[PDB]
């Protein structure tokens, strides 16, 4: 009778029962893991998701070109930040609410980071086995990519088959609306070539640099490949896979009768006073998203006493939950185009530090070479992190990425389809923020989410330089043929604005990038981490965090390719322990 | 207890029939539910999206915690369109739970100018909706307490003939127990120097000058939210049912007659798992001004130009969702000397000329010459459909200003350690809209556009009022306590002229969350949606009874009027019930 009829909506169907694994959150990592675990018919899984099934709704979900129309609806959590210090305004964090999580609402861009960035998760953040070669293999295993056709190659696509899986689960291929592709993509490529910048690198191969087109998470018929469509719809008839919709996981139930606390279940519901319990024989897996999974821990008594004590919550395990939050800032440059520029197409410039800063490179490098210690002390003073020595290790890692590997530092993302529009973000922010609960009741959803955008001076300078670069390249070389006047900033910022003018403009003309990671960072406890290299929360048995909370660093890429691989890798660790616990 | 009496399972009501269904358990919905169920033979089902919150603790029960609840599950936080004035989205605070926005509001208890309510009868053709009648219902709803000697010494003045003392809604002076700040009387002295009156009782029908006021709280200072006042005393009535946690999606219509009839509602939280419940007598929409019009549109009641592109058959064509009127608010904040310490709030209800000062000649010239152009422009933006009809509203406002000299702006003072003004133009000429953007009610995909500052007088008036708040903060007796401005502070030069304020204000304001008018109570020929008994035109058994229906803004805080509105509509409903038996 279809997937919808298989979904559970009544809490009484699971209340008081025991399953092998409970997954809080039916998003990208939650549904990937639920599918992987239920391949064994003897493993029972219950997914609890706050939203519902959305993959069949229609174009607002299924058409990637409708991106953004869903914002503000019931399928968007729209988490509100604190009043940001940079501009004394509240910001909204777009985040998908429904089966598939933010894969229901995202831009569909399918790229991978730089090899050195993933390698550092093992060599710097002490996560044995978390290196590019290992993670990339899981990524290719998840991937079901389609090579571009002659039309798509002619528009600018380049596909290196050795960097892609073709027999996996997540359908990926070129976006193709059916119309001609705009010549502006190739014009951007020519414009950066004039400056010695590479083009047409395959951004799945481990060196994202230059201007390239890329695959998207959609089927060949252009239907969005959201994680529910890819991982749940093919498998919903499995009797060992249960999915409860419309309910929030409030906290993890802990048993302290043993020598170490153990997660034995969860409480779920929609309002205080009408909750229900469900129990896990093996493990509870938190996958509610980087903004939520840390709060679930705090409501459970897992977090910093300085936070929990004033709220009346006993601290069962003291950990720096909710710190080390890393999101990027995004600004827009938009220009009208000539009729000859018409057509579809997206592309992105993954720009190095020196490409981003141009003639300011020397001054920017001087800051990078002298201020890391002071920046770390200040971020710690602002509550973004607790241990300055540990944070400095992160900053030195970023310096190594920039100076020794020349990784991409900013992304200039081009949309065409009738205009020339760049969304631009500094990929490697040095600011660190936090998320903390403000009340003991999980169902009040009263929390403080503060990414601390632009409170590090290099983040502001880098964003300003990258956005200025987007204006520059929009009217340089071959792009001049198609340029027909800037509309954003337009009248809001003089066209000849220098870098200092951009730095004054940017704090009042940016949005969150909604790429937040790090709130339950996977790194050693002594470095400020919350989970080990198998995603297990320190000091608690049978509890893991498996979502975007755990990446300890940002990366020069869009994260789906890594997060699918992440979930598969953690799933293998879960299954290994399951076999031992028999 | 009340919590155990509340329904949460849709199967408890699915497929059943009651006499009245009320969509929304907020201020007007719960007042009406209480009035209707006083007759034990009348059954009422309230369907509310939130739950019971009145016992949660200080975040709800302490008016001094105002604002802490924002962004939580008790705040709908409706997002606007990208506003044209600043290319930013704004958040509309709106209470989600039993009591609606009375759970989250500032508690201010004041009434408008007699001439404003009178115009509802003389300009907007609502027989019986005049000050004398509406105020009588307001006093009937009210249970006011006179100020004591400490509260009078701080600046309170209470005219007992303007207040009911045997009603339902507990109201009296806010009193935290601390000393009252001398700054309230300093503000009174500062405006006295300029010929402005003070200590008028803002409940008597002439809101003008600087006065203190009652708050909606009990003597022990617990918030008098509408659930505490109208539901908690009466929840044991078996004919009163309250379903929580569910959204009313649309009204079920029967076109079996010559005119459509409301026979029930569909409710739920997600497409594909909906439920029906039926009304023997009437469906009453009370989901708030941002929502009740969308429920009509989802039901096929609204403008074909909006409904047809979404695939919704227009059953009754009406200008639903137009005529949205909300105000803009800006802040001026200054530190105080230690001698200014203490509790206390006050408000300056300022006339047009008090607001504009030396710009009064300039502002009046605009008001006298551009009303027709402005009305055309608002209509072109989709805030209204009929320019001639909108011009009647504009001339009504002009009459209020020039002939009755009603208050045009409000400068609301908070102390308690600072001197902070929230300032808003009370009478915006801009008109906005709210329209659904999808056929699925449970997707909550809508376009809410108050069109802030898209009328040039609204921007000039806001700028002038906010500049006035800075001015009065450092004038006369207020100088004794001034210890430096913090907002705007460094963000706007302290000597800024009016033009500088007009460029600053679009980037430093918030919605006031007083939106009304989206189902305006006025003749169909004037663009109205409901008649003088709140009945939707062209539909039988359907009313809108909430903040959607006031056709104008008013120089006051609206609770006093909305409680009265609910009682008055309740009488009409019950008279029809009795006459039809
Ligand atoms: C976001 O919004 C926030 C506001 O919410 C905003 O932050 C405010 O910014 C404004 C500036 O616009 C700033 O206001 C100035 O404050 C000056 C006073 O310095 C402070 O003194 C305070 C009082 O000290 C006494 O009381 C306290 C408490 O009782 C005691 O602890 C003290 O011991 C003492 O007894 C202190 O509270 C305060 O410390 C705070 O700030 C520091 C930050 O460094 C922080 O570490 C600490 O924790 C505290 O929070 C600090 O010492 C005052 O001098 C300024 O007045 C000048 O300017 C105004 C405005 O133009 C004029 O009215 C005055 O007349 C005066 O003018 C003189 O200087 C002008 C130049 O500016 C010149 O033109 C003129 O001719 C004169 O020479 C001013 O009022 C305020 O303090 C900030 N913080 C707060 C909480 O309000 C923030 O910037 C916004 N961000 C964005 C991006 O927009
Ligand atoms: C909210 O955000 C919107 C955008 O989403 C924004 O509206 C846009 O504003 C910009 C200005 O900031 C507008 O762009 C300008 O448009 C005119 C052309 O407009 C006419 O013609 C077009 C078709 O050609 C029609 O569609 C339109 O309706 C009008 O009839 C151009 O003249 C402008 O270009 C000049 O300035 C640019 C930026 O500085 C230059 O790059 C360009 O070369 C031109 O520059 C200069 O030319 C000479 C060279 O020096 C010199 O004489 C002058 O310096 C001149 O500037 C510019 O592109 C845009 O149309 C608006 N609408 C849209 C949909 O984009 C809102 O303003 C914004 N609101 C707020 C409050 O921020
Ligand atoms: C606007 C936007 C655009 C993006 N664009 C791209 C792009 O172009 N390319 C790319 O690669 N990535 C993109 N992403 C990133 C990608 O979508 C996310 O990083 C990924 O979906 C995160 O997966 P996750 O499992 O950590 O969380 P999510 O996928 O967010 O899943 C978390 C789930 O938990 C649910 N939930 C929340 N609270 C609770 C609770 N208390 N109980 C139960 N369930 C709960 C949520 O409703 C959601 O279903 C974008 C993200 C956003 C927000
Ligand atoms: C921040 C703020 C401050 C205010 N301060 C003051 C003040 O100081 N003084 C004053 O007099 N007034 C004040 N008010 C105004 C007052 O609170 C409101 O005008 C009044 O509460 C409106 O009553 P209503 O019945 O129209 O709607 P509400 O009281 O908002 O009731 C609407 C109810 O419907 C529910 N609902 C929504 N959608 C649905 C649906 N689809 N199905 C079912 N239920 C639904 C809501 O959750 C809510 O309970 C303030 C308002 C706000 C927002
Ligand atoms: C980016 O520009 C910077 C600054 O101009 C260059 O940095 C210098 O590189 C030389 C050669 O390695 C070093 O000896 C200097 O100490 C560097 N200066 C600073 C301030 O760090 C850098 O070479 C450029 N990088 C690329 C890839 O072109
Ligand atoms: C702060 O973080 C640093 C870096 O992770 C920790 O320093 C390590 O401490 C252990 C145990 O004392 C030593 O064996 C290591 O040699 C230290 N490493 C470095 C690089 O200095 C430190 O323990 C943390 N301290 C606190 C209080 O959290
Ligand atoms: C408000 O101010 C207006 C404009 O300053 C006053 O009306 C003006 O009054 C003067 C003096 O009598 C006349 O010369 C002008 O022609 C009037 N102008 C207009 C446009 O009407 C008005 O009297 C003031 N109102 C109050 C109540 O003080
Ligand atoms: C537009 O609104 C105006 C104002 O209500 C309506 O104009 C009235 O039209 C009726 C019927 O033709 C006349 O009896 C009135 O005298 C008009 N009043 C005025 C003041 O001019 C007009 O009908 C409305 N248009 C629509 C389509 O309803
Ligand atoms: C605060 O406002 C008052 C009144 O608007 C200002 O004093 C006025 O100054 C103007 C300009 O010279 C004169 O037309 C008025 O007659 C003055 N009014 C009085 C009562 O004397 C005062 O200057 C303003 N304060 C600041 C700092 O701008
Ligand atoms: C394709 O990818 C493989 C693996 O990264 C690499 O060895 C090979 O040279 C690539 N081919 C091209 C043409 O870049
Ligand atoms: C952008 O152009 C300006 C003006 O030519 C130049 O000074 C600046 O360095 C450019 N930015 C970059 C990153 O190249
Ligand atoms: C109270 O207000 C009424 C109504 O406006 C008025 O007639 C009366 O004079 C006032 N009484 C006092 C004592 O101020
Ligand atoms: Ba490709
Ligand atoms: Ba396919
Ligand atoms: Ba370089
Ligand atoms: Ba095109
Ligand atoms: Ba609790
Ligand atoms: Ba991404
Ligand atoms: Ba009083
Ligand atoms: Ba007070
Ligand atoms: Ba006129
Ligand atoms: Ba539908
Ligand atoms: Ba009309
Ligand atoms: Ba009000
Ligand atoms: Br495209
Ligand atoms: Br009086
Ligand atoms: Br009392
Ligand atoms: Cl489908
Ligand atoms: Cl759709
Ligand atoms: Cl932006
Ligand atoms: Cl149900
Ligand atoms: Cl039924
Ligand atoms: Cl509380
Ligand atoms: Cl009564
Ligand atoms: Cl008195
Ligand atoms: Cl009873
Ligand atoms: Cl400004
Ligand atoms: Na450059
Ligand atoms: Na919110
Ligand atoms: Na308020
Ligand atoms: Na009375
Ligand atoms: Na106005
Ligand atoms: Na009417």
Curated annotation (Swiss-Prot), chain A:
pH-related activity note: Optimum pH is 5.5 to 6.0.
Disulfide pairings: 163-205
Post-translational modification: The N-linked sugar chains of the glucose oxidase contributed to the high solubility of the enzyme in water.
Outcome reported for the amino acid change (mutating residue 311 to Y): Contributes to facilitate the inter-helix hydrophobic interaction
Enzyme Commission number, as recorded: 1.1.3.4
Active-site residues annotated for this sequence: 515
Gene3D superfamilies, alphabetized: FAD/NAD(P)-binding domain, Glucose Oxidase, domain 2, Glucose Oxidase, domain 3
InterPro entries: FAD/NAD-bd_sf (IPR036188), Glucose_Oxidase_domain_2 (IPR027424), GMC_OxRdtase (IPR012132), GMC_OxRdtase_N (IPR000172), GMC_OxRtase_C (IPR007867)
This protein's UniProt keywords: Cell wall, Cytoplasm, Disulfide bond, Extracellular matrix, FAD, Flavoprotein, Glycoprotein, Oxidoreductase, Secreted, Signal
Enzyme's top EC category: oxidoreductase
Gene Ontology molecular function: beta-D-glucose oxidase activity; flavin adenine dinucleotide binding
Origin species: Aspergillus niger
Family stated for the protein in its record: Belongs to the GMC oxidoreductase family.
Protein known as: Glucose oxidase
Binding site for FAD: 28-29, 49, 102, 106-107, 109, 249, 548, 560
Positions bearing carbohydrate: 42, 88, 160, 167, 257, 354, 387, 472
């Amino acid at each position: 009778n279809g997937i919808e009829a298989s979904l559970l909506t009544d809490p009484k169907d699971v209340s008081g029962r025991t399953v092998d694994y409970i997954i809080a959150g039916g998003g990208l990592t939650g549904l990937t893991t639920a599918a992987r675990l239920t391949e064994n018919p003897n493993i029972s899984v219950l997914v609890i998701e706050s939203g519902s099934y959305e993959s069949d709704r229609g174009p607002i979900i299924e058409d990637l070109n409708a991106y953004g129309d869903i914002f503000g609806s019931s399928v968007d959590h729209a988490y509100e930040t604190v009043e940001l210090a940079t501009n004394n305004q509240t910001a909204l964090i777009r985040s998908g609410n429904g089966l598939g999580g933010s894969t229901l609402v995202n831009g569909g861009t399918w790229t991978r980071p730089h090899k050195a960035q993933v390698d550092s998760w093992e060599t710097v953040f002490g996560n044995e086995g978390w290196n590019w070669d290992n993670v990339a293999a899981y990524s290719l295993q998840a991937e079901r990519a389609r090579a571009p056709n002659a039309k798509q190659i002619a528009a600018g696509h380049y596909f290196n088959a050795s960097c892609h899986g073709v027999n996996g689960t997540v359908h990926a291929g070129p976006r193709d609306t059916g119309d001609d592709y705009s010549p502006i993509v190739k014009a951007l490529m020519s414009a950066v070539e004039d400056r010695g910048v590479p083009t047409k690198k395959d951004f799945g191969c481990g060196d994202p640099h230059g201007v390239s087109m890329f695959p998207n998470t959609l089927h060949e018929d252009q239907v969005r490949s959201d994680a529910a469509r890819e991982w749940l719809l093919p498998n919903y008839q499995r009797p060992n896979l249960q999915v409860l919709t419309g309910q929030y996981v409030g906290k993890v139930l802990l048993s302290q009768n043993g020598t170490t606390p153990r997660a034995v279940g969860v409480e779920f519901g929609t309002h205080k006073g009408n909750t229900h319990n469900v129990y896990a024989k093996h493990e509870v897996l938190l996958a509610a998203g980087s903004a939520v999974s840390p709060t679930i821990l705090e409501y459970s008594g897992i977090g910093m006493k300085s936070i929990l004590e004033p709220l009346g919550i006993d601290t069962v395990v003291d950990l720096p939950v909710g710190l080390n939050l890393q999101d990027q800032t995004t600004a827009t440059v938009r220009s009208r185009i000539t009729s000859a520029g018409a057509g579809q197409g997206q592309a992105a410039w993954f720009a190095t530090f020196n490409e981003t800063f141009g003639d300011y490179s020397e001054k920017a490098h001087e800051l990078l070479n002298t201020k890391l210690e002071q920046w770390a002390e200040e971020a710690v003073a602002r509550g973004g992190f607790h241990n300055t020595t540990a944070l400095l290790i992160q900053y030195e890692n970023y310096r190594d990425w920039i100076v020794n590997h020349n990784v991409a530092y900013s992304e200039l993302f081009l949309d065409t389809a009738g205009v020339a529009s760049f969304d631009v973000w500094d990929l490697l922010p040095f600011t660190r923020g936090y998320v903390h609960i403000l009340d003991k009741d999980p169902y009040l959803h009263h929390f403080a989410y503060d990414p601390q955008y632009f409170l590090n001076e290099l983040d502001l300078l880098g964003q300003a330089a990258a956005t200025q670069l987007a204006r520059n390249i929009s009217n340089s070389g071959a792009m001049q043929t198609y340029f027909a006047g800037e509309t954003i900033p337009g009248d809001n910022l003089a066209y000849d604005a220098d870098l200092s003018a951009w730095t004054e403009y940017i704090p009042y003309h940016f949005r969150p990038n909604y790429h937040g990671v790090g709130t339950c960072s996977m790194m050693p406890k002594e470095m400020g981490g919350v989970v080990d290299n198998a995603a297990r929360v320190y000091g608690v048995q049978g509890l893991r965090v498996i979502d975007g909370s755990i990446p300890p660093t940002q990366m020069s890429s869009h994260v789906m390719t890594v997060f699918y691989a992440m979930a598969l890798k953690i799933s293998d660790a879960i299954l290994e322990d399951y076999a031992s616990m028999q």
